[PDB]
Design a protein around this ligand. Sequence first.
Ligand SMILES: [Zn+2]
Ligand SMILES: [Zn+2]
Ligand SMILES: [Zn+2]
Ligand SMILES: [Zn+2]
Lengths: 72, 74, 69, 74, 332, 343, 343, 334
Amino acid sequence: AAMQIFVKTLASKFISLEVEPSDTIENVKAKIQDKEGIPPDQQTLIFARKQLEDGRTLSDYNIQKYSTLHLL
Amino acid sequence: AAMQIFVKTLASKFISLEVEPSDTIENVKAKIQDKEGIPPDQQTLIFARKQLEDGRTLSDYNIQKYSTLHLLLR
Amino acid sequence: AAMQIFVKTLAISLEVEPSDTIENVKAKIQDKEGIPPDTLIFARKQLEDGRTLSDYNIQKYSTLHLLLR
Amino acid sequence: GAAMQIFVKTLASKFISLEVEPSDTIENVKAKIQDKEGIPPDQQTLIFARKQLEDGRTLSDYNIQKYSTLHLLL
Amino acid sequence: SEPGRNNEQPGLCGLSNLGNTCFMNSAIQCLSNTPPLTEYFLNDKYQEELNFDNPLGMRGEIAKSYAELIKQMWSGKFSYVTPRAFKTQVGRFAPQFSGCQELLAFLLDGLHEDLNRIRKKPYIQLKDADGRPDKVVAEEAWENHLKRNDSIIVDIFHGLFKSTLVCPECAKISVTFDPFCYLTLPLPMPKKPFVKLKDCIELFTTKEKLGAEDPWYCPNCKEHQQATKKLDLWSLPPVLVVHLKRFSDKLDTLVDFPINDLDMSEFLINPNAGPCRYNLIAVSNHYGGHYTAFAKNKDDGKWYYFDDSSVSTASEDQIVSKAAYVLFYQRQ
Amino acid sequence: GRNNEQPGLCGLSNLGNTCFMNSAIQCLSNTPPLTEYFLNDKYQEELNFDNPLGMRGEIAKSYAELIKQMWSGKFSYVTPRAFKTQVGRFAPQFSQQQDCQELLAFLLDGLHEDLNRIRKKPYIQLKDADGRPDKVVAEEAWENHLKRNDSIIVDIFHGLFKSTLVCPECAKISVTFDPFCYLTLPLPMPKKPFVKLKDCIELFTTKEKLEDPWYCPNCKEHQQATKKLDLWSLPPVLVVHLKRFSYSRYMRDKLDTLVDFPINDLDMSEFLINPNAGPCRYNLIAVSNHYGGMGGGHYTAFAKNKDDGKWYYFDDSSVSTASEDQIVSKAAYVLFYQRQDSS
Amino acid sequence: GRNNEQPGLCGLSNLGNTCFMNSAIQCLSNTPPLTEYFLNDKYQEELNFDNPLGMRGEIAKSYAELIKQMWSGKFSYVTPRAFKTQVGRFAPQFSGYQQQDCQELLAFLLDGLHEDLNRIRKKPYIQLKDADGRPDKVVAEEAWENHLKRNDSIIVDIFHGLFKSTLVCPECAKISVTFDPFCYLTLPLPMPKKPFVKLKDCIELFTTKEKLPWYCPNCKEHQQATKKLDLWSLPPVLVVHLKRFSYSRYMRDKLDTLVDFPINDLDMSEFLINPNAGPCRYNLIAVSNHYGGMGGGHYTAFAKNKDDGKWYYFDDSSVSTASEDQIVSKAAYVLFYQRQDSS
Amino acid sequence: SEPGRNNEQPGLCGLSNLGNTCFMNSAIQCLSNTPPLTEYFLNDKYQEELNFDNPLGMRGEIAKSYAELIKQMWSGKFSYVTPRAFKTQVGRFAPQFSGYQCQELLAFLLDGLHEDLNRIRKKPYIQLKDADGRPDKVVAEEAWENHLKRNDSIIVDIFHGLFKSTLVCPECAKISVTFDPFCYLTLPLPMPKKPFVKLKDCIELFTTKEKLGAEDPWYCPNCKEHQQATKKLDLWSLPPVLVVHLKRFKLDTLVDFPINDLDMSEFLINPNAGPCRYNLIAVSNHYGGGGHYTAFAKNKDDGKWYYFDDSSVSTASEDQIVSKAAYVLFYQRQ
Ligand SMILES: [Zn+2]
Ligand SMILES: [Zn+2]
Ligand SMILES: [Zn+2]
Ligand SMILES: [Zn+2]
């Protein structure tokens, strides 16, 4: 089952997303594109000072519910 | 605001209660009656070598959460 | 038997008995260095004439202090 | 004045007094013990601080202090 | 004339037997000869502090009755007095004694509440340590105590120890700092004919397994458990009341206790505790039964023996005996 | 380069700005359980070439071959080019300068994934304490960790925290048990000239007020909670990072506080809130030093040789004898401690 | 003067320069065993009118009648003219301007009261002997009986003790050991002058070997021996004189060092070399103060009243309440300590 | 090509049995793994200090023999060696340890090594003098200088400490205090036999007021007779290596002792002493006729524990060290 996560912008206010543990990082960047007008070219997503690379799912990194990614 | 306390039975068993600091000793005896069917007429409650008198609240005795009172049958 | 005591001038040995008067010691004192009996001190306490040194329990090898005037 | 008094615990657990100098050999000490207890020095063994005093050594070699009490064994 | 009325030295006043009071008369003589307590009452300092509506008090009657008895005993007008009014208040609020050292415990707590300056008490949630240093938790415990308990009794008799509980199942350690108004010291078991008071203090501070009297709920195990309790003295009051626990059939053990220079310093785990030396000021004796008292008179410094209505001179050499039951120590 | 030397007494040539790579290698090279594992060829069977968080085995393989050269006894120094090439391929951040302190974290995590015995990882829903006893929750967290993370690195370096978070609004308390492979100790601020290592550990376990975005599920928004950490279990090798860079990203504004740490008989026993943990005493085995200067500064290492037990100083290609009395200095940056009797 | 007052709370009006007569009287007046002895009329039978070393009862008679006035409760103060004239008759050194050695007045009073009440009506001459290697308990006993054969009075009962004297010759190194009586202790202060010292340090100094008019029988003359004192037995009332006058002859060059002394629970046991001595704990009962100034200065007294246990301050004719917290000051000169339970 | 001769790690060297030696081999292994002692000999540092004419020595033969044995044992050329030369010097100067009926072998070796290396080559005679009321800190320092005037060696540097000895006469009741040097402690165990005590209880028994026995006759200067005084010992200063003898003579009591962090602070009556904590470096075991002895030891080079049973050397874990067989413990100051 899918879950809610967040990503903190530079200006320190957050965006809520629906994602599945099976969702690839391309979706998370695409969902950020689907609603925030930000193309996946623009974005680098970081979590726990360990940076998620594209091609991996959110399961590969064990992203938990209410986890908050950092957007660069 | 509520808290959990306990009372040691005659049989050395333990009863759990939900209670406020503002509830009187009579009321606690009534909750003990709702759980063990023992009339407040025969209930004496002891804590810290001191008998809990009716008319006082458990705030009067500063009863803390997870405190375990002693039940004796009069 | 007699015993030895001393009286140290401000700058000397005696043979004496416990029954000797303080004057006998002072009568010895003129005889001693030519000093007229006109004050003997022992144990921060002044010795009076007329008293014996048995009265003061003066021990042998005791050292008295002699002061003048 | 160099002289001093030391003691030796006899076999009967009696104590024997001797006059001694630090420069005296263990042989001299054993000889004085014979003058007082009639026991030949070839038969005597002297112990102090769990140690034989050996022949040829002085009591200065073992730093025997005055009023020390040696053990005599046979 | 009148029976008991003579012109005597103040404080050298007996108390007639009025029925059988357990250890009331002996207890009164011990408290009467606690100088800071008696001076407080003789100087009319209790009227300002009388609490008539304390839910745990006696509507001021225990303090009023006690104060008025003390005024008679130190008036110099009596060789002995009959404490009928004070006995009546004890019988009315404590029938359990009509018909044993817990009478002293009742009196200290009744005096405290009848003079409690906290005149509407806040409910206080007491808190375990969590790694905070002993000095932070102990200070916090004392102010929480003072928020509900502030009286001449707290100033004179109350101290604080450190309580360490260990769960048998969970093995979790819980540290609280708890107030006390007296110490109950155990004697060595089985009987030794002679023990040093310090050995009893060291028995007091030894880890012991809670019995039926102390059911304990483990917050971690969510389980009632038979914890192991360890007590350590954190701070000691100006007057230390020491109860020798002889009933647990009576142990006649001769507990040797100092008349002077009781040094508790080696037992204080507080590194900021200063030197803590005590002098004996009173002893309650129990004969296997009947209770009496030794006391040092505050005005002349001499020891006296109080056997109900009889008051007689006493020597320090006759105080230490197997009858010693409760000891009163005053800080140097 | 090729000389006849004592195994392990081997320098590492300088190759530009390597962050603290050479110093980091010397510290790891002198972590005996790690080096013995590679020298005995126990990594060959355990290499993970398909780990989604790994490096296709290239980091471990490369590191192993560097360790084999350093402990072969044929070199006074070697050039860690092959290992550096793999580090740059997967961690370009260390040459410009970008938080050189995370290289140790990258290496420990990179070695771990390249040797992870869990060969397809389940997604695991992590799990608050929620009133259950500590020992049950902590064991549950360790098994959850071990189901996705099982390697020689976990065996050597991984421990467990207890994390207590409290929301400022709801006052809700959330307790989790989290793994770590190293500790970052704060220093007292403002800067003191002298501090004991234990004082830094006690600050580490002091509750702080939350750049860590945390959601209170009940109170409805993100909040700046107060977090408190307690050491539950400690690894056989404890890596201690002294946080000396107030401006960590560019290694600027360094705190020169003299941290006094023991060479021997470090007793972590008073900091363990786990009652069933045994006595855990540690002896120092290595220290990474930082000397300030032009740019990022320079890094060196002290290390104790496992074979002779003596201390040595490693400055890139130079290896020289050292005394335990010269180790404690303000240059100390990362401390490597080994639990007594784990070898 | 005439007043309905508390017994013992009685001043003594000033009569010129009497050294510390008033202050000394108040100290003796508040020595309970001494005052009880006079108030209970046991001195008449013990008056010695033939003592060659006495004042044929006149010092004791006048003193007794002064104490009776002071403890009758009829006076707030009295003018001690009769006692002063008797002191001047037998000790003119303490008269008027030309005063010398004011500290010997207490010694004059203790020795004068003793001789006017000496129960020995004809004193034998006793040949004193040092120990000859005999054990301490035997020699000290022999010395005490020799003392009591010539000296037996209430003053001996209250004030007399025994110390051990070890004298050492520079050649012979021969040791001669005596046991000597004392009725008071003169304590040295640390030199050079310190601003603060504890009473035990001054006592600890009193028992240290110091070099002095002594004839050695072995080396057969007069030499500067080293004398060492150890306290063997202490009296029920211990009078402690602090040596504050380097130039004692004229009260010149006074040491203002603050000597900290206990008001209660002075335990002297650690200074007693007699193992069979009982517990020796002391409480303070009186203090003579000296305030510097032109002339010989001024003396006052602190004393504890035996009936109410409170402290009072006596400044000639003035008597006022005092707190134990003001007693310890640099003005303290002579201390009166009473053994616990002597009364 | 000999038995024993293999290429081994230095210090991991056994000692064959030659006859049947009380605890010589076990004692040697304990001393061999005292790092400051072995470093002193391995660095050739004893030649300058050899004393061949000491009246209480062995003409340097005990130290010379020991040094040459240590050099073999730490050369790395032997899995075991036959300590024939050292045994011959032990038999020649201490025949009492021959014949099959033991801890004073260690006391003999420490004391013999000391005299064979004593830097004082003509010893002055010194009048020792007790406190006589002087403060502890003055009398103790004086005793140490008196000790060093006759006894100055690597053994004193490593093994010697100082306790305070308080004697009380039963008749006369006078207290006489001396400060006496020691090179090891003999700890009593509780009697009657308990199954378990740890080490601090034994130290507290050691410092407990003690009634002198037959082997300790004492003359009272005051009574001028012999009396059975009560002696009291308190630790004043401790050496860098503290040798602790558990007095089992047998008491099979299990004495729990720390492998690490033995804190002696509560037993030091010297206030000016710093923290005094010790780590274990060696243990002599006794298995109960005459008994056989073995040793646990920590190797100074690799820090690991090993087991020494005559010629056999094997790896060991700290958790097997504490057993009822422990007899002599070697502690090194942190
Ligand atoms: Zn639990
Ligand atoms: Zn919230
Ligand atoms: Zn001479
Ligand atoms: Zn004696």
